[PDB]
Design a protein around this ligand. Structure first.
Ligand SMILES: CCCC[C@@H](CN[C@@H](CCCC)C(=O)N[C@@H](CCC(N)=O)C(=O)N[C@@H](CCCNC(N)=[NH2+])C(N)=O)NC(=O)[C@@H](NC(=O)[C@@H](NC(C)=O)[C@@H](C)O)[C@@H](C)CC
Lengths: 99, 99
């Protein structure tokens, strides 16, 4: 669909078979989800944001549905202020910025 | 135009008489620009995201051209690692997310 930005671009996602709400984020390289139990092997890494760096668990090849669109890729799990869907998965669902 | 997300959606902007490169961030409520000596009155506020919060100066009615599109609104100035164009301005240039 076409989503305007007057409101935060929040969509429903399905991960680990669980429904969550996430923010479509063009300014995010990666996808970061709040702490949760996720079936899969992980590796600890650090990511950055506007205020500094935080440590997250890196899960690869995770099946996730975004607004009904399928994506299978890297999902970072950690203490993020909000669930965000980054470019790694936005490209998978064919999302583009238009103006 | 249409901007794909294979790489960071960076565009040229003009603010305070200077040209800079900024990130189109749909996951940002407001606009945060790198430290620059913008003239005029301002208000001290704090803004954040991943890693925490940072101190910035809030300027109102700032003229800013984004990728050739004129806009006018609130601009936060401070020690941000990246020039961030938020929704407050993305809506003004008619930007949408499409998939
Ligand atoms: C988590 C909060 C919501 C999403 C977030 C995404 N921001 C981009 C900004 C660009 C970097 C400064 C970001 O953090 N992107 C990260 C997301 C994490 C990730 N791993 O993708 C990123 O791409 N990080 C890269 C590196 C970015 C820096 N790059 C560089 N210096 N070359 C990384 N780690 O790979 N939004 C924000 O940070 C904005 N905050 C907000 O919109 C809200 N604040 C809060 C706390 O939620 C609102 C209430 O103010 C900031 C800019 C203030 C308006």
């Amino acid at each position: 669909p076409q989503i305007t930005l007057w409101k935060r671009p929040l969509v429903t996602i399905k991960i680990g078979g669980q429904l969550k709400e996430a923010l479509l984020d063009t300014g995010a390289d990666d996808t970061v989800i709040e702490e949760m139990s996720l079936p899969g092997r992980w590796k600890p890494i650090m990511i950055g944001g506007i205020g500094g760096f935080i440590k997250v668990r890196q899960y690869d090849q995770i099946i996730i549905e975004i607004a009904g669109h399928k994506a299978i890729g890297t999902v970072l799990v950690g203490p993020t202020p909000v669930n965000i869907i980054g470019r790694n998965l936005l490209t998978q669902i064919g999302a583009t910025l238009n103006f």
